[PDB]
Design a protein around this ligand. Structure first.
Ligand SMILES: *[C@@H]1O[C@H](CO)[C@@H](O)[C@H](O)[C@H]1NC(C)=O
Ligand SMILES: *[C@@H]1O[C@H](CO)[C@@H](O)[C@H](O)[C@H]1NC(C)=O
Lengths: 439, 49
């Protein structure tokens, strides 16, 4: 048959699915998702890195007035200071006393570190989800992988199946992402050609080997001191170089639902959000006829010890009588109880012991062993320890939750008043019917 | 796994204590006193002879 089931997107919890083909022995398939990766579509917007301030030797125009030449360099700065009289080791460089000027010129370029040390601004929009699933099929562990969109059929060992699409479209990535070596940050980076000085993005280029670059660094040249040969200028505090200090916390620690972020390629691993639909078709060769499977009779179930905990704290011993030797599927018809073992080997007039997990204090549940249900009545105790290092697997419980004496107690509390109300209604009726024969 | 019980201060009488932790077979421990020593703090005032 074509079997459709939906399992929650939670890593480390094995889910068993009951396939019921009419006239055939039920089949239990155990599936556990190892990893769910969300690789978003990346769009490289730009790269940012450390700048290099190329400052040449100042043009000292001796006995003349210097003139600035208009170049198309990024953040090109030129300033001509009059009345400069620079001094060297052996005195004045200039023969003239006052008509000498200093031309200061400076321009900004990318540093060499831009090829190795860099931050990338990417635009992430949509994510392609893919999952690796382990299935206990016919006593064997098989590992499959496919992208979970519902349009990628994978047939292994004659089993055809398709996975997804995800019920929830939530993603930890926003529209704007910034990637640095092994760290990803959700940041609304400034757009390209509009950076602010001293902020993230003060110098921007499109690719690591491009030749044009955008710069807004506020380079302002100051007048040099009297008789001093040097080029004073206003510092351009690189936003990228101190970016490494006010980063806060990366998405690896801040993303909800325990998403793990990796790079090269960037991906979100094990995001515990929603459930996933999986459809598995399998022909009749895996199925076994009801006549070919062994039948059973005189089933009894006893729970000598039970504790409702994360581990298999419940153990149930079922005494039975079978007809022949063979493999039988065990399945709980009650969602509150989960059995670790999926398939047993039945022989004849023997007894079986199974391990189960439940969250309810009492457990009245029917187990369909060899296509036949048996009722088991249990009571389970709370455990001694408060913190477990592995998550639970019995979580499916609500408010209509059966228990021990509790519902007998709420029965005994419900000794209502309707009898006294009825005898007062009787008195009211016998007062009305003295003269109320008409209306 | 801490079991707290109270036994009478009597030497030579074996006492049975049942530790029943749920999901484990019950265990009975027999306890026996051998000596109970009361050592007071002494302060020498003086000697006579
Ligand atoms: C290492 O450096 C090379 C060249 O500088 C660069 O292309 C590459 O992306 C870098 N890889 C890592 C993991 O930093
Ligand atoms: C399948 O793998 C799981 C985990 O490794 C293990 O508990 C189980 O016994 C394995 N079963 C078989 C048939 O290999």
């Amino acid at each position: 048959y074509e079997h459709v089931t939906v399992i929650p997107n939670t890593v480390g919890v094995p889910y068993k699915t009951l396939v019921n083909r009419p006239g055939y022995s039920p089949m239990v398939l155990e599936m556990e998702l190892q990893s769910v990766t969300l690789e978003p579509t990346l769009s490289l917007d730009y790269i940012t890195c450390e700048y290099k301030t190329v400052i040449p030797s100042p043009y000292v125009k001796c006995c003349g007035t210097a003139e600035c030449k208009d170049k198309s360099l990024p953040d090109y700065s030129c300033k001509v200071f009059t009345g400069v009289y620079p001094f060297m080791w052996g005195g004045a460089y200039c023969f003239c006393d006052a008509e000498n000027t200093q031309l200061s010129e400076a321009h900004v370029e990318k540093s060499e570190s831009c090829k190795t040390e860099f931050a990338s601004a990417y635009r992430a929009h949509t994510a392609s989800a893919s999952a690796k699933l382990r299935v206990l099929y016919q006593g064997n562990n098989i590992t499959v992988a496919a992208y979970a969109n519902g349009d990628h059929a994978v047939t292994v060992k004659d089993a055809k199946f398709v996975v997804g699409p995800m019920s929830s479209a939530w993603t930890p990535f926003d529209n704007k992402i910034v990637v640095y070596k092994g760290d990803v940050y959700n940041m609304d980076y400034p757009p390209f050609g509009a950076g602010r000085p001293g902020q993230f993005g003060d110098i921007q280029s499109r690719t690591p080997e491009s030749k044009d670059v955008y710069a807004n660094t506020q380079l302002v040249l100051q007048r040099p001191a009297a008789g001093t040969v040097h080029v004073p200028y206003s510092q351009a505090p690189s936003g990228f170089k101190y970016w490494l200090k006010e980063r806060g916390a990366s998405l690896q620690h801040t993303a909800p639902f325990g998403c793990q972020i990796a790079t090269n390629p960037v991906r979100a691993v094990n995001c515990a959000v929603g459930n996933i639909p999986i459809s598995i078709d399998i022909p009749d060769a895996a199925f076994t006829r009801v006549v070919d499977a062994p039948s059973v009779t005189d089933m009894s179930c006893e729970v000598p010890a039970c504790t409702h905990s994360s581990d298999f704290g419940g153990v149930a011993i079922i005494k039975y009588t079978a007809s022949k030797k063979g493999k039988c599927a065990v399945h709980s018809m009650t969602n509150a109880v989960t059995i670790r073992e999926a398939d047993v080997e039945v022989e004849g007039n023997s007894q079986l012991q199974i391990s189960f997990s439940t969250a309810l204090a009492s457990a009245e549940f029917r187990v369909q062993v060899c296509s036949t249900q048996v009722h088991c009545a249990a009571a389970c105790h709370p455990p001694k320890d408060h913190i477990v290092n592995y998550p639970a697997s019995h979580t499916t419980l609500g408010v209509q939750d059966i228990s021990t004496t509790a519902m007998s107690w709420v029965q005994k509390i419900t000794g209502g008043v309707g009898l006294i109300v009825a005898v007062a209604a009787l008195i009211l009726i016998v007062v009305l019917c003295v003269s109320f024969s008409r209306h």
